[PDB]
Amino acid sequence: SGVAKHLGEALKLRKQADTADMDSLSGKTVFFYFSASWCPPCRGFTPQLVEFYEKHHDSKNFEIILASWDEEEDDFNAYYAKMPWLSIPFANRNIVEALTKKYSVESIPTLIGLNADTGDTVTTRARHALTQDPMGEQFPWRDE
Amino acid sequence: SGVAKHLGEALKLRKQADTADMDSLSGKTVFFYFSASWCPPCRGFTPQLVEFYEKHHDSKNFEIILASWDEEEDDFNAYYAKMPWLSIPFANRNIVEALTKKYSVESIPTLIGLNADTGDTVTTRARHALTQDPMGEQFPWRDE
Ligand SMILES: [Mg+2]
Ligand SMILES: [Mg+2]
Ligand SMILES: [Mg+2]
Ligand SMILES: [Mg+2]
Ligand SMILES: [Mg+2]
Ligand SMILES: [Mg+2]
Ligand SMILES: [Mg+2]
Ligand SMILES: [Mg+2]
Ligand SMILES: [Mg+2]
Ligand SMILES: [Mg+2]
């Protein structure tokens, strides 16, 4: 795991125009958000997730990282511009493909929540959970 | 660290023509080898490291990962073709840049050894140590 940790920490995540380090994730719940500019149900969900994040990410101590299924860089940028959170850089498609496989992401939009420190999965149903609990009263929607 | 571990594990390392996963690193000493096709002292050291690896990587339980300072992809491939070990993919320049910063790699060839499981640094002087101990009798050349 140690080597993997160093390689992971060597990845710079996008933060809008900037790129950032990973310490900022310490002690938070972190979500990977699998979505694409071209996906119609994503287009309906992303605005709700944006609103939920702006309102609750501080108080509920979470971060979101876009894991984009856009393969065109201009579409990737147009879409990420609408988001207030972080992204795996467009160039790191390999990483998105691997995470997609890891979490059995068979459709989008999908939101996978995990403990930043342990790496343990917290929730795989947060896309559907959030639509039913827009206030986040049952956040982080733990599986089972 | 958990998020970083998942991102690291999502990176596929090059293994010659193939790309491989990271479990294969379990319980080994792992070295990052910082070098470039264009570097004259690298050209003199790489053949010795190749010979040392072929002879000892199994019995001394270690792996090597190229962290290339080549910025041209054809030169990167020509050079890596001479190596029997693994590489960070050419496309993952960002990662090489970060690891270079992390381990204060100010010149090449440089060999940085670490425990694969803990991630802890074992040796930062292995380039010079190996030339003086070609049999690896003092492997892994622990610092201080
Ligand atoms: Mg690092
Ligand atoms: Mg914030
Ligand atoms: Mg980008
Ligand atoms: Mg990648
Ligand atoms: Mg979901
Ligand atoms: Mg992974
Ligand atoms: Mg071998
Ligand atoms: Mg490559
Ligand atoms: Mg990279
Ligand atoms: Mg060295």
Numbering used by the authors:
A (entry chain A), B (entry chain A): 2 to 145
In the authors' words:
The crystal structure of cytosolic LmTXN was determined at 1.8 Å resolution. The crystal belongs to the space group C2221 and contains one protein molecule (residues 2–145), five Mg2+ ions and 66 water molecules per asymmetric unit. Accordingly, all the secondary structural elements as well as the overall fold displayed by the TXN family members are conserved, apart from the N-terminus. LmTXN was crystallized with one macromolecule per asymmetric unit, but in the crystal extensive contacts exist between two adjacent monomers, indicating a possible dimeric assembly with potential biological relevance. Mg2+148 and Mg2+149 are placed at the interface between the two-fold symmetry related monomers stabilizing the dimers with a number of electrostatic interactions involving several water molecules, the oxygen atoms of Asn93 (O-Mg2+ = 3.3 Å) and His7 (Mg2+-O = 2.7 Å). LmTXN displays an unusual N-terminal α-helix which allows the formation of a stable domain-swapped dimer. Solution experiment indicate that a monomer-dimer equilibrium is present allowing discrete dimer formation under physiological protein concentrations. The active site motif Trp-Cys-Pro-Pro-Cys shows the same conformation and interactions described for other TXNs. In particular, Cys40 is solvent exposed while the buried Cys43 participates in a hydrogen bond network comprising the highly conserved residues Tyr34, Ser36, Trp39, Thr47 and Tyr80. Interestingly, the refined S-S distance is 2.66 Å, intermediate between an oxidized (2.0–2.1 Å) and a reduced disulfide bridge (higher than 3.0 Å).
